[PDB]
Design an enzyme around this catalytic site. Sequence first.
Site, PDB file in Angstrom:
ATOM      1  N   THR A   1     -25.139  36.729  47.174  1.00 47.23           N
ATOM      2  CA  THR A   1     -25.686  35.771  46.234  1.00 47.23           C
ATOM      3  C   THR A   1     -25.465  34.553  46.320  1.00 47.23           C
ATOM      4  O   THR A   1     -25.990  33.286  46.227  1.00 47.23           O
ATOM      5  CB  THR A   1     -25.505  36.258  44.757  1.00 47.23           C
ATOM      6  N   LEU A   2     -23.857  34.244  46.365  1.00 47.28           N
ATOM      7  CA  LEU A   2     -23.258  32.874  46.588  1.00 47.28           C
ATOM      8  C   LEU A   2     -23.005  32.627  47.949  1.00 47.28           C
ATOM      9  O   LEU A   2     -22.272  31.735  48.281  1.00 47.28           O
ATOM     10  CB  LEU A   2     -21.919  33.004  45.932  1.00 47.28           C
ATOM     11  CG  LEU A   2     -21.281  31.548  45.336  1.00 47.28           C
ATOM     12  CD1 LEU A   2     -22.212  30.836  44.337  1.00 47.28           C
ATOM     13  CD2 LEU A   2     -20.006  32.065  44.477  1.00 47.28           C
TER      14      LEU A   2
ATOM     15  N   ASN B   1     -21.976  40.087  41.685  1.00 50.24           N
ATOM     16  CA  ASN B   1     -21.413  39.642  43.048  1.00 50.24           C
ATOM     17  C   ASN B   1     -20.817  38.018  42.915  1.00 50.24           C
ATOM     18  O   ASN B   1     -19.998  37.698  43.868  1.00 50.24           O
ATOM     19  CB  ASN B   1     -22.101  39.820  44.173  1.00 50.24           C
ATOM     20  CG  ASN B   1     -23.598  38.832  44.237  1.00 50.24           C
ATOM     21  OD1 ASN B   1     -23.905  38.286  43.151  1.00 50.24           O
ATOM     22  ND2 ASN B   1     -24.348  39.285  45.114  1.00 50.24           N
TER      23      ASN B   1
END
Lengths: 245, 211, 240, 212, 208, 246, 227, 204, 230
Positions: I1-2, H103
């Site tokens: 996640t980011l 991701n």
Amino acid sequence: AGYDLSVSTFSPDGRLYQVEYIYKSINNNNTALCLECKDGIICCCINSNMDKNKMIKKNSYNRIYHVNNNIIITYSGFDGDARNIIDRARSEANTYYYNFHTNIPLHILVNRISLYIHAYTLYWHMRPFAASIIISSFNEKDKGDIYCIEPNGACYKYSGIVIGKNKEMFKTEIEKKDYKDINVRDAIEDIYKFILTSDDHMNKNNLQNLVNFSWICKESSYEFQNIHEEILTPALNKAVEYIEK
Amino acid sequence: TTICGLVCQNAVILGADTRATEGPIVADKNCSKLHYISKNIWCAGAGVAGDLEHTTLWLQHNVELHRLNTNTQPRVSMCVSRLTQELFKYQGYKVCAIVLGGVDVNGPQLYGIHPHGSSCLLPFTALGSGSLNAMAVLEAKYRDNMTIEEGKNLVCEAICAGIFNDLGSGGNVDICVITKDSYQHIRPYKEPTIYPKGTTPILSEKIEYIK
Amino acid sequence: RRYDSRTTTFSPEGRLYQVEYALEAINNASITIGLITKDGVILGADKVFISKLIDKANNYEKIYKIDKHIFCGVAGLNADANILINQSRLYAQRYLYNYNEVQPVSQLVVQICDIKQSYTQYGGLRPYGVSFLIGGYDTKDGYQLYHTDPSGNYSGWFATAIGTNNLTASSVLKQEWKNDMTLEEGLLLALKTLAKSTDTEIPKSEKIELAYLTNKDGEVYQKYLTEKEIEELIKLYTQK
Amino acid sequence: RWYPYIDNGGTVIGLTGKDYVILAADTRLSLSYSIYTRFCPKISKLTDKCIIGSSGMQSDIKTLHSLLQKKIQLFVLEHSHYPDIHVIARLLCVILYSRRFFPYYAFNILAGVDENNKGVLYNYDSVGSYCEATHSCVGSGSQLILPILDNRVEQKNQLIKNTNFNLGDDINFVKDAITSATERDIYTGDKTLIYVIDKMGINVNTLDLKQD
Amino acid sequence: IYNYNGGCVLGMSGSNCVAIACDLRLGANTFTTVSTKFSKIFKMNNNVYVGLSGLATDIQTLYEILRYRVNLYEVRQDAEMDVECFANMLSSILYSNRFSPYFVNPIVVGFKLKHYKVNYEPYLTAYDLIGAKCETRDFVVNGVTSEQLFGMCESLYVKDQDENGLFETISQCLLSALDRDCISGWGAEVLVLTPEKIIKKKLKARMD
Amino acid sequence: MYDRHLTIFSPDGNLYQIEYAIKAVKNTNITSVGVKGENCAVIISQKKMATQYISQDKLLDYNNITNIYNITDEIGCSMVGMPGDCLSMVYKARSEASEFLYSNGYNVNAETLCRNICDKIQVYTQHAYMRLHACSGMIIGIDENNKPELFKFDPSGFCAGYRACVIGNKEQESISVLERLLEKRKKETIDEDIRNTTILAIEALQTILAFDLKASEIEVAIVSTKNRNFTQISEKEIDNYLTYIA
Amino acid sequence: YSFSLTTFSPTGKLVQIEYALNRVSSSSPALGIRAKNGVIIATEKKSPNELIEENSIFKIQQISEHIGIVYAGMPGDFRVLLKRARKEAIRYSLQYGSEILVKELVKIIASIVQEFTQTGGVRPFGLSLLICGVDVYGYHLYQIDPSGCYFNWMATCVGKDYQNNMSFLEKRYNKDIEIEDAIHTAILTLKESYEGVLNEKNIEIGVAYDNKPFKILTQNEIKDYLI
Amino acid sequence: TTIIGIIYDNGVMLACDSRTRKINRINENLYVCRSGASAHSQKIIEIIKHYCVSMKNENRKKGRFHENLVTKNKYFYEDKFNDYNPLVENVAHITKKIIYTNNNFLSCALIFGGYDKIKKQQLYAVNLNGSIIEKHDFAVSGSGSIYIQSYLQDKYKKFMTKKECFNLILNCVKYAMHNDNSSGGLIRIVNITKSFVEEFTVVN
Amino acid sequence: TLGPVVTGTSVIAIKYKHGIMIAADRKASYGSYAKFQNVERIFKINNKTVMGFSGELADAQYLHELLTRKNINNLSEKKRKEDMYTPQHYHSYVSRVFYVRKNRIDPLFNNIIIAGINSQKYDNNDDNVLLYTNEEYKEIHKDDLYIGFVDMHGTNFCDDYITTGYARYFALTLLRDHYKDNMTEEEARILINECLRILYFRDATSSNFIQIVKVTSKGVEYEEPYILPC
């Protein structure tokens, strides 16, 4: 003549003796049987060898395990190898569920376990697994499925199977009648009579502390469940009474 | 640089200019953009020249090896897969936008490969600084099921206009025709004071004869 | 374990029993000669005859060159010879790359013998059954000549013969060789030794090959005699 | 673009006597300007005669205390004696310096009673440096209370001087200091735990502070 | 990055004759000359030469690598290397380090042998720092003086020429180009290579 | 000593392990027959247990037994040998087909698959620590030129094409029967050829085995341009064809 | 677990290499001839039954557009060596951008065979390669061996009764032989060594025609040549 | 880019524009529509197709069993009863895992449509990062779809017929193209039903 | 996640007589879009255990997968009802996972709640477990119930009531002001309804379509979703 010292060497007659020796070792270990009925399937294991030991707790040595709480897996052979294979089956199921968010189909799990077992019979350094495994399941729609994997790495489907000591007599008893029409609850009597007759080491007192029982049927909502005493004891008593007469 | 590609009646046609630049100056006036991949597949790209040449040689030799091993005519889809995987592996840092043309068992086909690794099959396309003009002319004039002569005339129209319009493209016009059997490569298709001896001063000399 | 060959293992008397068999095989190969003169170093050898259909042109099966100033001759298995020659070339060019100067012969022989010793000690791999005669020239020491063997042992020599019948060739070399000699006299002596070791009164131009390295005009170069040159040489030898 | 460091705030106080040590600590866990819970002890018991208090990232101090307890238990198991306070201090220094480049956001005080019945306090820093002292404080209230302890104990800048100190007076002084920090600081807390280590085991009491 | 230690190399073709010339400046911090002997041309084979321009350390490293590879190939094959093979190997070597590359922009100049007697065909090419090979068949330039050399060669090139005319043209072009660059110059060296012999000369350039 | 315990040459140049593996394959006494016509290829085998320590029991699902698998929708296979070896080989074939599709963008050809499997078998024969997979096999498919192709491979890694072949015992005596039937054929609609090939395969297996071949005891599959997928015929049509043969 | 299965015996002789050579000596013969303007590699395939197709099994391959190869020994070893030779030629072309020289490729293959003879846990290759080709340095015909040592031939034979075949080939051979005459001599030698009756589908031939791509003669061409 | 999917009775429909073929056929009864980065989407599509082939081969049983212009094409399912065709849920979840593990770089929104025997027609949405949600009514993605969201919500019914869903999806895509500036070209639509799949394109 | 893309709003968990009650809205906002309005944000690990959620959806799903398979493994080697892991076990496990991810600088943009019963003396549900398919409530001493919080940075603790997201300001205030001990189910539901109504009025990311789950002596019960009375 030196053709049986390694699993990786073919005999002049084209035969792996090192695997036949494993077969012979397995055939001398405790016996385990499993068959299917209308409601479900019943797996029984007979630990006749441990009758000499008088210090083991009652029904503490169990050779029946489960995966996904709906697939029964049992063995007849070395305890360590069987445990290793059970852990591999659990790992395979875990990877399948992580990848596809769904329980592994049984016919795929049996293939994977057969490949895993076979992978240890073509090197010289590794020691081939000395165990014969049975994996079975049941659902209201597809009915019961039973598969038997063996040291050579061959998986076959059965409607009822026995492995280990006195397997021939037990099989003869099983094919005596058709159990596809008998109920899971009333099949316990026949199983008990068979284990009493075929095995010459167990008696009345040995039946409640050496034989492990379980089923996957409709009563358990088609989920793995060990048989409790309130059900087992009546059938055991009836079977011994019938035999005594 | 201007690259154009078109699909004609059971054939493919590629066209290119012959000018390379090192900034605001022209280094080579007769460069060769068209590259030979196989006997029935060709490619022509824009971007970093070194990346283009290296990738083209790599793909050509891998395709030849695969053909020898499998003993089957090469297919454009395999090459497309190779470029896509390779470029996607390098995160697109190897900037080379390619037009690939071929005639495999499935008939003629043209693909456009982009630096980031994406690919798309098209009936006609163009890349380079002059891509806009050439593709404008193509879309204005292009038709389906053309004749080889008409296809080549349109391929000029495109590349020739791109040369006359875009500053970054110029020189001659290279063209290639791909058929299921055999191919043609027309390199120059269209193509639209001495000092007295001793003048220079020196302060040393040494002659060594070659054995 | 049951099938282990016991390769890198000392013998009851400390010989490893493998370098011994390798050297025994070496003694059966064709004979190779080596001389040092006032004008160059010579590595005349004897060609083994397989058939009459082998390409006479070029096709040097005994003498090779590892650099413009170093060239050697083989007296053992040809495959091991070839791979060791490749290793020697790699080593020489790596030295040139590192130090920007040509490698002295001693360094190259030390390296090749080190790899042979490594193959003799570590692992269970069999040793190399090849023995060379590395000869060349360098500013530090001038003309030199060495002699290796499967054990990784090397020693300097002024005149030597290795391979089958090396004893007779060495006897002739010791009997006739002199401290200083012209290149022509060196070639004549090498040809005489080759003929005597072969048990043939007159060598056949198609049965031998000669070569020599010289530092003419400050530029070391090697020359490999061709059939006509060896023919003239044998004519001269017969005259004398 | 994520910063893995948050100060949960709080205060820990430590004082020493001739043969005893007192270690007080808040019991408030909080975030930037809001309080998670009103009870989260910061003092973990290491041995029967050694405890540790910490201030900073609650997760970091919890993990550090658990790891140090595991190390001490393993040492006892494999050597058959309880490590002394000096051994524990050096082991903690080594553990802290292990993460020299991702240091724990934990300021530590290690209190105990040596084998000779001497109160010992060791004050550390976030990266490993430590030094023995007769009084210390860590957390948000460090800068606030440290002068108070300095005046009370060392008693410099004074001419009359008074060194007659006993356990009860020390306990009362610690309670006064923690109450002052609570009044004059926002991250201090609302309920405090006071551990007293003496020759005869250890004891713990609880005091109630303001809730603002 | 090229301004630090600037340089210039040129190469031209004639009738059965080739010429390669270079400047002889090695500087530091761009505007400070340190040596006037650093030659950008390295003989690689009896009839193959490579002119390297750019950072001196990269020039030396690339020259050493090329010498290693060429010597290996020549010894293994027992024959001289071909210009085409050398050019292809140079391109491959340069591309081998596409990321963190060698800050050098070289050119290759030599003879192509057409065996049948044998014929000598001039061969020239220039590269980018990645190996963007592009055959030119005519004048080839490379260095910080690329623009001036291009202009001079365009104005002065006379197609096939005698070796004397080739030397005059190349020397004049190089001298004119170098006089318009501040970070390059400080002497010039010219090699005229023909099948029979090679003539290496140094011009009386503006040493200032 | 140990001249035949490993894949080592032994005197007079004989890798005896190869022969022992081939003989172990033969001992399974399971017969498989493959025959190709025009735009159709048929593979037939017996639905029976192999020969080993375990014997078939009454409580055995005979439908589950089968000696024919399929590597891909279009590429079919039939293995004969040790059960574990057969399973491992089919899994390797599946893996190779999948990787070929992934790395080339188009479905693999049965010829390339046979060559790759032969290469793996060669690797096994080369080294000492690897035991030989005693499992021979046949592969069938259709190439890009819309034509059938049938290939066979042995434990020695010797892949070879065929127009009619048999795996199992009595192969030498069965080549004659296959040749006779093919010659008789040489002396048609796109579907009539399918029927002719199927009856030819069934007759060949009947003659080689020399008994009835109960429809419940045999399994047949076919690949043709009409379908192009390795679909195995059901019991009813096999019985109908067998009745026609009678 | 990695130890040398091939070891020196008293007097050396590398017994395993001798057994590989014995294996080679029992396989189908294959020969080659170097002519004035071309090279030929021919071989004989045992009369196949009606079920085999000669189009599926090929004993004549091509590594490059100018280089051909024939073998006599273990088919699997031949296949793997062929793949590796193709890979080596491809990488040589990638580096130097040209057709790989015959001598260089022979050197790489010989080194590979030698390494396989040396390394532990493996056994020597059981074939005897035969590579013919054309390059800027004229024509070439080399023979590899299980020992990994190559020979430069002008005309040679390998396999069963290779000594008799070599003697016969030497009896009628010339340095200035025409390519057609070389083909005829190859056919005669193969017929003499066969000890039977030859015909199309029983022989295979490959030829390097001057500066033309290496060609594997089809069935009709050899049938016409046989008359 | 506009991607829309609608679950009607006994089947499912997926429609897309053409501007930069956004519907890809993972399997005979399994299609996926992709929006976002083109290269990432194509690579993920190839990977998931590889995985789907692997699982389809793996789960095959042993023995015998069961004894403007509207140009359109029809494909009948080869595997009757879906004996071995992979479940759509497994494909969606493996795609979700692949996106999740990458991701940090992968940025693409996917919509999975298909038919299964276990759970009939299904519609899944895999968003940015590893987020997967099962939609029972409809799914929308791309810049264009935002303009038609409310419209769809207004004109959707619980049990629509084939022609009703046809018209609704066609009008939705047409409005999305009309408003959105980055969506255009001919409209591609695929209908996946219990026993066949029919794909057509409208040039209006 | 980011970084969060699709996020949940908040959850509220409180322990009362007969067990624990946990409520959360059924909506996942895609920034300021509200794409999904029917999402199950309260998962179940096993009988007597449930996991909350307020944060990015992908990380919550991954953690759910991890926890459910840990439960499967626990069952596989289970022989007595005392072998089942307690809520404390799972809370410590998730705390360790979060701490490791923090040390790796790749956290999960979540704030987890693990709530259940850590006592086995009240019911015999775990003696025969049923993952597929599915009297009077027994009063539970508050000491036998467990609720644990887990923050991005690994910060964790236990208390009698926990809330995440914007509920940490409104619902937390209401609970601290009014929460009592041993309150019947009706009172707990009333309090939760008041808190969620307050959030609905003053929280853009919230909604009135609510899911309420109860962990009691009968196991885990998913009550039918209902719309807030408002």
